[PDB]
Amino acid sequence: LHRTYSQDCSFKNSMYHVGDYVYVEPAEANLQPHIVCIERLWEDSAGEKWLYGCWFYRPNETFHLATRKFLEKEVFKSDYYNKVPVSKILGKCVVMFVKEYFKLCPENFRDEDVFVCESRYSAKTKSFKKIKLWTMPISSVRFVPRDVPLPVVRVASV
């Protein structure tokens, strides 16, 4: 299965790039699509197009104390990396580092598809840790100053 890697990948009417975030179809009729950062793309010798990257967990996808507070739209950088066929992408989204999320917003994305990341999460130890520096592929999305900054809302889930 010789693979030809690329910085971008076309599928139907869509074009995907390394550094994009995408929603990926889960293995359950009623289950939220997963957020994955595209870190590599390829076409294999069978003609199938694939992405590989890091999974981002929503709060309800973590084991957490009932009292833990979450930002609105918060997601967690997991230690889970896997490949997915490009045919399973349901759409694009954006995850922003906590330091820029409140001041900047991505051009051409609905607010519901923009998430904020402050911490990583490990399923192995069921624990969180604040991220010191944001290390992800450079994305092609364009960020502009928000007209008015978003409020900082941290509340528990339960």
Could you please describe the fold and organization of this structure?
- The chain has 158 residues and is mainly beta.
- The chain has a single domain (1-158), classed as Bromo adjacent homology (BAH) domain (SH3 type barrels), CATH 2.30.30.490.
- 3% of the residues lie in helices and 49% in strands.
- A six-stranded mixed beta barrel has the order 4-5-7-9-12-10. The protein has a two-stranded antiparallel sheet with strand order 2-3.
- It is globular and about 50 Å long.
- It is classed as dna binding protein.
- The entry lists the keywords SWI/SNF chromatin remodeler, pbaf, bromodomain, BAH, acidic patch, nucleosome, DNA binding, DNA binding protein.
- The assembly is monomeric.
- First bromo-adjacent homology (BAH) domain of human Polybromo-1 (PBRM1).
Identify the notable features of this structure and list them briefly.
monomer; about 160 residues; mainly beta; SH3 type barrels; six-stranded mixed beta barrel; two-stranded antiparallel ribbon; 15 strands; about 5% helix
